[PDB]
Nucleic acid binder design. Sequence first.
DNA 1: ATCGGATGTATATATCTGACACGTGCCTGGAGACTAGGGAGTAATCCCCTTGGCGGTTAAAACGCGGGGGACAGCGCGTACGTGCGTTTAAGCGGTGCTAGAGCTGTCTACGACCAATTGAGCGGCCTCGGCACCGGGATTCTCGAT
DNA 2: ATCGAGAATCCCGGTGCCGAGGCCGCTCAATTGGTCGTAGACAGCTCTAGCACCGCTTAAACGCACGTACGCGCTGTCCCCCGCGTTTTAACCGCCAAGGGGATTACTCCCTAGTCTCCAGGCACGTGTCAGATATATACATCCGAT
Lengths: 109, 108, 99, 99, 85, 93, 94, 148, 76, 83, 82
Amino acid sequence: SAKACTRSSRAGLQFPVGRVHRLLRKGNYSERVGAGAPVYLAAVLEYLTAEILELAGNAARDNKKTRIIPRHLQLAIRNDEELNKLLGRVTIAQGGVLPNIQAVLLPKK
Amino acid sequence: SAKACTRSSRAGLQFPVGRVHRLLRKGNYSERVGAGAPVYLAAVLEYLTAEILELAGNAARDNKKTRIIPRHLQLAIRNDEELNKLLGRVTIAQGGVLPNIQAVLLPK
Amino acid sequence: KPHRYRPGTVALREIRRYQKSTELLIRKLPFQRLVREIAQDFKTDLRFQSSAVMALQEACEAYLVGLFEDTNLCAIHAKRVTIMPKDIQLARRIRGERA
Amino acid sequence: KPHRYRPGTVALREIRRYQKSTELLIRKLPFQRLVREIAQDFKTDLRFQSSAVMALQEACEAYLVGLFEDTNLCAIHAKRVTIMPKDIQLARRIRGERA
Amino acid sequence: AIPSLSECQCGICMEILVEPVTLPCNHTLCKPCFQSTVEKASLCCPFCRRRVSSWTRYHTRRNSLVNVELWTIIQKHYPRECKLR
Amino acid sequence: RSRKESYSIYVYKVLKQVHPDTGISSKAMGIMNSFVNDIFERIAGEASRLAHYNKRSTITSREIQTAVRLLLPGELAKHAVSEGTKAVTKYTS
Amino acid sequence: KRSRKESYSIYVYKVLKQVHPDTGISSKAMGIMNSFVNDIFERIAGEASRLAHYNKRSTITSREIQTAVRLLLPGELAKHAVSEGTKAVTKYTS
Amino acid sequence: HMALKRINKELSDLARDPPAQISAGPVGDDMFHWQATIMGPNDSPYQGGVFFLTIHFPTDYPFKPPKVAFTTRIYHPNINSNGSICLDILRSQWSPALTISKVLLSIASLLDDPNPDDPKVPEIARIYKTDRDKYNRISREWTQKYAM
Amino acid sequence: MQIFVKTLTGKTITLEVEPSDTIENVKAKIQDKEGIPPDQQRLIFAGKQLEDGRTLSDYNIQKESTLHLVLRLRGG
Amino acid sequence: KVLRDNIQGITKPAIRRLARRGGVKRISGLIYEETRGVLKVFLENVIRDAVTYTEHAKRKTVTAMDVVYALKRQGRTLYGFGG
Amino acid sequence: VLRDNIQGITKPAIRRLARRGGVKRISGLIYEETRGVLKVFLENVIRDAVTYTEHAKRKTVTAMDVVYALKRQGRTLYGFGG
DNA sequence: ATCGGATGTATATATCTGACACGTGCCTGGAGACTAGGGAGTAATCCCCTTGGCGGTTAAAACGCGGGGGACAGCGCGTACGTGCGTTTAAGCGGTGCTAGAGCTGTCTACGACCAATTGAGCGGCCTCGGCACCGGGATTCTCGAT
DNA sequence: ATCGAGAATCCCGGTGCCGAGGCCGCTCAATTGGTCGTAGACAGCTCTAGCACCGCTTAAACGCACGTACGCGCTGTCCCCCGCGTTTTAACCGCCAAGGGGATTACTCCCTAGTCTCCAGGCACGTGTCAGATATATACATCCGAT
Ligand SMILES: [Zn+2]
Ligand SMILES: [Zn+2]
């Protein structure tokens, strides 16, 4: 890089790099922290947040809304498959449950 | 207590206080380790070890044996209400399973 | 002459209505009083933040909803549609909660 | 004329014998070959410590024994004695392994 | 056989045994000594040093620490010192 | 008063980068903050355990990469690893 | 010669002799006991560290370890372990 | 409380049959404070020696061990210069069934032969390990001019 | 020549010695006037250990010198 | 100011609504007592850890953070309340 | 290279495992499902083990890697190390 | 087979209110330059342990067949649960009053990190004898077809 | 209700084997002593908000009655695992041979923690405004008795 702009801008990211580095150092995770670890961690966090936010925005638009509410987040997480495994044990507050009814319980033809 | 002896003997314990202190300090748990923490931790570890070993030896003697084997350890662990709760997900290698047959399958 | 629905349709309508919404389903004051009673049983003279009560209520509701889902699956597995105490007991036993 | 036991009265003997025993119930070489074949997919020319194979076999047997316990419980709940694939499927669904 | 008068004395407080208990190592003490021993001593057999931690925890909830037969024998044979206690 | 750090501004920036029109409320902001903190803690803990297990004392990039490969499922892990490698390569020059 | 490898073998055997004065232990069960000791120690230390960091502290005194023991163990084991540890600390101090 | 009755009963026990070569009694008004006198054993380099030591009884007895300290100075590997006693039975081997008579008998038994496993002072310990004659001579030259 | 020594108990002890007197004589005086053998008793001056072999004159001990006394106990 | 027999606050319609959200079409008559027992057990388990956390801090009020930490320790992570 | 090794888990092996599990009567379709679930579990463990042994710049999958993977998945194993 | 109530759900429109989005002062934490020192990269070497291979021998696997017990479908019933309506009730909302206690700040005293010397606790290697494994014989006890 | 014969299991004694508990030599990490920067204990102050009280609604809960549909027990059918005997397959034990690489040690270099100095990124605080919830009034999907 040019070594002239801010650290977050040098790596072409949006999440902070200094804050992540400080959290890694003061978090009692290891005696030493490398110079490239916070950049990688910030990139991973930014990618995951972007994916979840994109899914939530699509869900909100499909529901005729303009503000991401917890219901949209729950729908986006549940309807996906990778994020469902990643967040299997997480309970989103004010989120509800996916709508489904078992086949047997439906009225007879 | 009086000084001028091993730290493991001042508190009356058998587990090594010094080794526990070194592991706590170099275990990346916290910046500073208190003086009383290793003694307390070693006492807890020794109590748990004795608690398991007594029941294991009791089972071994009940099985007409004078040498503890993993089967006796499994028998002692699974027959106690609290030790089973503590060691929930742990799988003891070559420990077998507790004898149990459902009452429905028994012949009438 | 009076019109009434056959038993079963109102249940399906209620299911469809409740799965769509996200509001709380237990009255706040009874739950708060129950939580206070349990806490005072544990330690005397305790004060509760409102957010703590809300978090406890949300967690309990989510856990009960999951338990009822598992119970419904167990009841369906045995050629039935009603949920019975043995279904809840079997679900809890398989989940490892009570062993 | 030759003596023949009733159906099911020797299976109980097998249950009593195998629950007392602590040895390994699967053969060694087939399991080792299966483990090597599974592992070679991720990376080529791996070499396996014998202790690793032993630990893998122990863990697999423990997991399968637990799964059979749970599926037998489900079968008993379904007012039957035999175990069927739907019992295993229900047990794994409730345990949350496959969702 | 009748127990000896020498043996029925408590080793710790040198008093007549009251609701005594028998350790797994065949060492008997009166319960007033045993109950006070556990909280702030080595929690073992005093004459013997045998750990009874699991035994004590298991028996305490069952409330079966006291030995009924031994207590009854001395209580019936020699009630006079039991009454003054 | 005492300052309380949060990832709110950065999450807002990402949202505006992805969906220029949609907004986000307070509850979703808190949920995003909790999710980011949870993922950070998970990855950092796994990386620390990996560093300790191999008799090391520093957390380089490869420990983070292996922790990501361990935690996330297939497609998510692959995409995250690619993104992290790209970010590190762009940063080092 | 290979390097030193540390373990809790001697102390576990000493505890076993203290508990049953005439019973030995096989090597497999010995390794099992060593692994159990390591697991419990790691659990308690990690919980204590997390609890200490949650209160903006920097030291792990006996209070944090005691609270971790209270949280990790069941109803009766926790009480007995707390009693043993308090006794040990009191005897060590004076 | 119970400690008072225990102390009274055991002082009676020592009264009606004191063991040979050992004497003990409470000099202070408090029953906790005690003094004891031991004469030099015949099979030892401490011939003609008399030793006075003090015993402090903690608040709770007998579940906690008592403390014993020699007022006199003796050249012994297990003893300290200031009189602090390093004996196994006191701290890690205390038991409620033990009595003062038994612990004094144990002190005499160790005065017969010092413990080489865990000496209190290392220099005199290694001097004793070096040669028996040097240790015996130095023990004599200390004890005959300190005992009297 | 009066010399002050302060022990771990805070007690100040005045000893009459000579510049040419060896530390062996000083230790004998301490054990006579206090009843503690000299094995565990050594002097500290200016942060330096006073070895028993070397005499006082080599340390340039002056009038009314201040000495520190610390009890050393060995493990076991 | 003690409270007696307050488990009845989780009335029958509340359990019915929770089951309806769960996906149950028909409910037996003995479900409610078992559900109340399960709820009591779960609440006791969570509140024990919450009270321990507030005890260690020498504090007299349980906060949302303590409940969140107790739930996270118990295995059921919660989102949206801080942490 | 190896192929078609899942058949090494013979029917008597599954039968004995069920007998230890406490099963009195077994249908005829259990074996295929059991083979499938065992294969899935083995893949899940082996992936983590191979990742662990790849991180350490090694070539032999030691038992410690398998123990670490099992502990990570939530199935702590006692006896082979740790 | 649909026909027509009759119900509930979906849909178009006014509105106004509190939460979301943006602007601003500033201060605490991030950024930049320089040193030193230890951790890690890299090269060379050992021998431990993993892979490959062959003979036998035998316990385990594969195959086939008779059949008895359990999976499964259909019938009948009566009892528990859904549905709706009138009534008693405690939740829900507003507004106020107050003090227990969370939160922030200044002092400083005692607990804990760092460094050298030292030697004894613990670890690696050997070894031998006793507890455990195996085999042969006999006594004991579930089990079932037939009474 | 049972007797008795075929078969599986448990007790007991004798013999042999290897691994586990004790012993010796030894290298390194725990102990002792001292010094010093700092953290958290403590006293003190502020001011947030959790608790208790009141009054007025009206939404949810409760009890009762009616009907109905389905959970359970019974009967019957059938077919498929179980148990046993016979044959074919490779697992396992033992043995030998080769070499890949895990583990160790020595050397050097450069990456990062630590330090100080400087400054701007975001954090708490304030204010404007419109997204959406609420209410009101139509339009259509859907459920039920019955020809
Ligand atoms: Zn007594
Ligand atoms: Zn005893």
